[PDB]
Amino acid sequence: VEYDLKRLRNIGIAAHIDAGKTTTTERILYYTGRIAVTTCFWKDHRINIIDTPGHVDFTIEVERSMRVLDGAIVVFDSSQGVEPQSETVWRQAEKYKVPRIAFANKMDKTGADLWLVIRTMQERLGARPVVMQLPIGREDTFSGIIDVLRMKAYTYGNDLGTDIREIPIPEEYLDQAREYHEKLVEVAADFDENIMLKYLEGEEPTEEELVAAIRKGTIDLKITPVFLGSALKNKGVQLLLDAVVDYLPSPLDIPPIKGTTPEGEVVEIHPDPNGPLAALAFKIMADPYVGRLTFIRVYSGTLTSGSYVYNTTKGRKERVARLLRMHANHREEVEELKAGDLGAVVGLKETITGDTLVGEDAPRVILIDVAIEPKSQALARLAEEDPTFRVSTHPQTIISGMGELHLEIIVDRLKREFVGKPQVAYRETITKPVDVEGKFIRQTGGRGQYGHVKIKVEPLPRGSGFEFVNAIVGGVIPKEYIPAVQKGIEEAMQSGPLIGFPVVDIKVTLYDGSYHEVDSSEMAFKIAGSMAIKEAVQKGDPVILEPIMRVEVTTPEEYMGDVIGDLNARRGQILGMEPRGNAQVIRAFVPLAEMFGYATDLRSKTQGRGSFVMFFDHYQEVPKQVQEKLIK
Numbered sequence: 001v002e003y004d005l006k007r008l009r010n011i012g013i014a015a016h017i018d019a020g021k022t023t024t025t026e027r028i029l030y031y032t033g034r035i036a037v038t039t040c041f042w043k044d045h046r047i048n049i050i051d052t053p054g055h056v057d058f059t060i061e062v063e064r065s066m067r068v069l070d071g072a073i074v075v076f077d078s079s080q081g082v083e084p085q086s087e088t089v090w091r092q093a094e095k096y097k098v099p100r101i102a103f104a105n106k107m108d109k110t111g112a113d114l115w116l117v118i119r120t121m122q123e124r125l126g127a128r129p130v131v132m133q134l135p136i137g138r139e140d141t142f143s144g145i146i147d148v149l150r151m152k153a154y155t156y157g158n159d160l161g162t163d164i165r166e167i168p169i170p171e172e173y174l175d176q177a178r179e180y181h182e183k184l185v186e187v188a189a190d191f192d193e194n195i196m197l198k199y200l201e202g203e204e205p206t207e208e209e210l211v212a213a214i215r216k217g218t219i220d221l222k223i224t225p226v227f228l229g230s231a232l233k234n235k236g237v238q239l240l241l242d243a244v245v246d247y248l249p250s251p252l253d254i255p256p257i258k259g260t261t262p263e264g265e266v267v268e269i270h271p272d273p274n275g276p277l278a279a280l281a282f283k284i285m286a287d288p289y290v291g292r293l294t295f296i297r298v299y300s301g302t303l304t305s306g307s308y309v310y311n312t313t314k315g316r317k318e319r320v321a322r323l324l325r326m327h328a329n330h331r332e333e334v335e336e337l338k339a340g341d342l343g344a345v346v347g348l349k350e351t352i353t354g355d356t357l358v359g360e361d362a363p364r365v366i367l368i369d370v371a372i373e374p375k376s377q378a379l380a381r382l383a384e385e386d387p388t389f390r391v392s393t394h395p396q397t398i399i400s401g402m403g404e405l406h407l408e409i410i411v412d413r414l415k416r417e418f419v420g421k422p423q424v425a426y427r428e429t430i431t432k433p434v435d436v437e438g439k440f441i442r443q444t445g446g447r448g449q450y451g452h453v454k455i456k457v458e459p460l461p462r463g464s465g466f467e468f469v470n471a472i473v474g475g476v477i478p479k480e481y482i483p484a485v486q487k488g489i490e491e492a493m494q495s496g497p498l499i500g501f502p503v504v505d506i507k508v509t510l511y512d513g514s515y516h517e518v519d520s521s522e523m524a525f526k527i528a529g530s531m532a533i534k535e536a537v538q539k540g541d542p543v544i545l546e547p548i549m550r551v552e553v554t555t556p557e558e559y560m561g562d563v564i565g566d567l568n569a570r571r572g573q574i575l576g577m578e579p580r581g582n583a584q585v586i587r588a589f590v591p592l593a594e595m596f597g598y599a600t601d602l603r604s605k606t607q608g609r610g611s612f613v614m615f616f617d618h619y620q621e622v623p624k625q626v627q628e629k630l631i632k
Helices: 025-030 084-095 112-122 173-191 193-199 209-220 238-246 407-411 481-490 523-526 531-538 562-567 598-605 624-630
Strands: 007-012 039-043 045-050 073-077 101-105 129-131 145-146 154-157 165-167 224-228 264-266 276-284 292-300 303-306 307-310 319-320 336-338 344-346 357-358 428-429 452-454 456-459 467-472 506-510 510-516 542-554 576-579 584-589 614-620
Touching: 007 238, 025 045, 025 238, 039 238, 045 238, 073 084, 101 112, 101 238, 101 598, 112 145, 112 224, 129 173, 173 209, 209 224, 209 238, 224 238, 276 307, 292 303, 407 624, 452 531, 456 531, 467 481, 481 506, 481 523, 481 531, 510 542, 523 531, 542 562, 542 624, 562 584, 562 598
Parallel strands: 007 045, 073 101, 101 224, 129 224, 467 506
Antiparallel strands: 039 045, 145 154, 154 165, 276 292, 276 357, 292 344, 303 336, 307 319, 307 357, 428 542, 452 510, 456 506, 542 584, 542 614, 576 584
C-alpha cells in the first residue's frame, strides 16, 4: 500500500465556472471519500487534486497551476461542446504540454449531445478524440452509460449515487457500441503494433493491451479519450475516476523538469527520491490555525519534517517546521513527502510563490517596472505577498504596476478584503548634449545664501540609467556640499519639464561653479542643482518615452488575419509568431498606451477565442505627433 511512484496521479480539473469544475470535484471527493491541494485515494491510487485558478485568464497563477500538476481533465459543458472559454483553457494545457482527458458533463441538460462535443473538439481544438463511452437515454432521459472498451453498461438508479447496476448492453444500442468499440480497437492499433495484427483477423485484444496502449497514446499527447456524465445528477463520477487511474500520468511518466543553474545551463530534474531535493512553492494561503502555509511539489530527493532548505530565488535559508496533507475532511500531519508528491509546509517566512527550494547540501538551482499607476493598513499585508506592485512616493498615493485591473485585484483585495486614472508610466530625457549653470543668490532675511554650479547633461542610451560625475578640481565647490547638489539634482529628476514625469537616461557632469566663503550653505547648492537641471532639460529638445509592449496573442488560424490587422493599428510592430498546436500565436510590440481594454477587442475580433499576454519590454520615444497630442 503506502506509496509507489507509479501509484501517484497528480491532476487538476481544468474547466470553467459553469462547465462544472466545482461540482465535478465536490463529487469526486464525495466518492473517493468512502468507496488548495486536496488529496484522496481511489482504488490503490493517491490522487492529488491541485486546485486550478479557474478564473479563466490570469496566466501567472495558471502557469504555476500548470507546471505543478501532471494530469488534467478538461471537462466540457455538453450543452455546447467547445464553448469559447474552455478552449483557452485547453490552449493553456496545450501550451504546457499537459496530457489530458475530457468529460462531457451536464449530459442531461436539454442540449446534451455527446457528438456536439466530439464534433467541436475535432474542429475547434483539432484534437484527435477517442470515444470512450456511449450514453444510454437522451438528455433528461439519460439513464445509464456504456463502456465501449470492456463493452459493459452501467445503469444509475437515481441522481444521488446510491443506486447503480452493471448490466449487459440492452439490444437497443447493441450495434452502436459494437461500432465504436471497433473504432477504438483501431485507434489503439496506431500505437501498439501488436494490437493491429489482432484488428486484422478480427481478433479481440486483451483488456490490458487496450487500456494500456491507449494510455501510452494519451501520455504521448497524440489523443484525448472522452468520457461523459452528469455531476449534479450522480452519473459517471466513478468511471471518470477509473479513467484517471487508468490512463493519466504518474510523475515518472512526465519528462524531468529543466532548471536554470547559475553558470547557465538548464537541467534534468529527475524525480529520484534518493536524489538531492528540489521543490516548488506555487500557492500560499494564510490559514486560521498554523497560519501562513506553503504548498509545494517535490521534484527530486526527499523533504523531511524539521529540516533546512535553501531558497535560491531569495538567498534566504529556511527551516521547515512540520508538513501537512490536505484532505477534504481532516488535515494530515506528516514527517515527509518524497519526490513526485506534494503538500503544505507549515512554518515559513520571507519565501513566496514560484520560489525554488533546495537542500543545504544539495545543488542550489533556480527553476517589470510596473508601467501603470492610479491613486497604511492594507498595503503592508498586501506587500507581504505580491512583490509585483509598488507603494510609491510621487507628487501622494500611487499604486503602480503590472496588468490592467490586476491592480483592481489589489483595489478589491483592499476595500473588500480590508482612485481612477489607470495611466501609462511615461518618462522624459534629452536628445542633445547641453551645457548649463545654476545660481542662487538670496537674503532669506539677515542670513545670505549662495549656491552656483555648472553641469553638462548628455543623452544616455535608453536602458542606461542615471550617471552623476565630478570634474571639479581642487575645490571650487567645497566637498561638503557636493552631495547636497547631488540631492537637488536627484529631486528635479522627479518631475520632468514637459509633462512632469521622472527624467531618465541622462549623464550629469558637474565641472565648475563658485561659492561665497560664508554666504554659501548646504541648502544653497541643492538649489542651483535642481535648477541647473530643470534648466538643461527643457533646453535639450526633451522627449517623452512611452512603454513599448511585448505581447502574446493566441488566435486560432481562423481569425489570425484581422488580428495581425487590428494589432497593426495598435501602432504595433509584429515581429514573429509560432504555431501553438492547433491555433497560432503572434508575438509583437505594441505601445502600452495603444492597448487598453484590448481584452474585449480581441474578445470580439475572435468570437472570444483569442488570448494575449504582455510583459514590459522597453522604452522608446514617441513621434511628436503622439507627443503633441500627449501634451494636450
